[PDB]
Design a protein around this ligand. Structure first.
Ligand SMILES: O=C(O)c1ccnc2c(O)cccc12
Ligand SMILES: [Cl-]
Ligand code: NI
Ligand SMILES: [Zn+2]
Length: 348
């Protein structure tokens, strides 16, 4: 299904919305994953928090200034870590005249304005903020406790990886952006926009991901030579025109507050924020992810980079292949079109 591999949008009834893992299996049964990105707007009823009128005092330990360098569709973004500041301090700076959002009509306007000025007046981003905004009593899509097989990591080793198996908060500003990248260990990803201005996304189908990396290695040969997966550095930005110019299939979508965004294994994505906003995210997994995790090409030039031991997952879900795998003979090939095993129920 979804032979065009286009970004899909889902409107779940409060009944379908209850079980996270199930609905994920459902959208995968509808081919949503073939796009790499999918949108899911919660039932008109559901709300994760009562009011965001208290966060103004919340602190951002390390906001970053985004310096972008480049021309004609290709840019490298550098990070200048700033001094701690509150959401209030941030909102004032984000709303000031200098970092304010430009006036526009159609989205295609803000888009061209973005790719035209991303190298000027470097903005601030309140990213990687350890925390959650969900109310401890919410049992639907709580980024703090999704209850997926990714919990196996902490259960078996006690290991915690901030932002991956724990929630991260991102306070946006106009022109703040996220470079092209797949999730760490090529995991799944969930992003919820609590409030504020929109956040636009660009996505490349997992079945075409390799083409995007070939293009990236060609434009950034130096970075490519220094690292087997420099794109994981999240410093590379590439405009849509540049992708079109080289036949790279991709889709666009805008995430407004109260909506969910789901990225799938090996799905390349990128985008930028329209203005001041808050977003919460974390990674998660399904049985299907295991193979992706086993084959994930990781960063080889940085100590920091995330690396999960697949051992425990292969043992529990791929016992017949464990021995062959530890011997390096598991030559399984991945079919990015196949839905996760758990979707069987919705395929009868
Ligand atoms: O900055 C974002 O809003 C964002 C969107 C999608 N994925 C992200 C990520 O994987 C790491 C940090 C930020 C993002
Ligand atoms: Cl280079
Ligand atoms: Ni991401
Ligand atoms: Zn690297």
């Amino acid at each position: 299904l979804n032979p065009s591999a286009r970004i899909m949008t889902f409107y779940p009834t409060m009944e379908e919305f209850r079980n996270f893992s199930r609905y994920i299996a459902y959208i995968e049964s509808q081919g949503a994953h073939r796009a790499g990105l999918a949108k899911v707007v919660p039932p008109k009823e559901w709300k994760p928090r009562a009011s965001y009128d208290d966060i103004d005092d919340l602190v951002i330990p390390a906001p970053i200034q985004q310096l972008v360098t480049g021309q004609s569709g290709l840019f490298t973004q550098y990070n200048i870590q700033k001094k701690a500041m509150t959401v209030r301090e941030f909102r004032k700076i984000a709303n000031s005249d200098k970092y304010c959002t430009p006036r526009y009509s159609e989205f295609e306007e803000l888009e061209r304005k973005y790719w035209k000025n991303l190298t000027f007046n470097p903005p601030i981003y309140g990213a990687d903020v350890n925390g959650t905004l969900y109310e401890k009593h919410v049992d639907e899509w709580n980024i703090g406790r999704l209850r997926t097989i990714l919990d196996l990591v902490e259960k078996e080793s006690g290991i915690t990886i901030e932002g991956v198996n724990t929630p991260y908060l991102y306070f946006g500003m106009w022109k703040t952006s996220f470079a092209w990248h797949t999730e760490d260990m090529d995991l799944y990803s969930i992003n919820y926009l609590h409030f504020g201005e929109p956040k636009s996304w660009y996505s490349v189908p997992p079945e075409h991901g390799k083409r995007l990396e070939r293009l990236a290695k060609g434009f950034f040969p130096g970075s490519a030579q220094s690292c087997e997966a420099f794109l994981r550095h999240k410093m590379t930005l590439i405009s849509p025109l540049m992708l079109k110019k080289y036949g790279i299939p991709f889709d666009k979508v805008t995430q407004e507050a109260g909506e969910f965004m789901i990225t799938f294994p090996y799905g390349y994505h990128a985008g930028f924020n329209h203005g001041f906003n808050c977003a919460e995210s974390t990674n998660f997994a399904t049985r299907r992810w295991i193979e992706y995790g086993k084959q994930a090409v990781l960063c080889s030039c940085r100590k920091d980079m995330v690396k999960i031991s697949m051992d425990v997952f292969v043992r529990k879900f791929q016992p017949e292949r464990y021995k062959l795998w530890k011997a390096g003979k598991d030559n399984t090939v991945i079919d990015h079109t196949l839905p996760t095993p758990e979707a069987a129920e919705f395929l009868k």
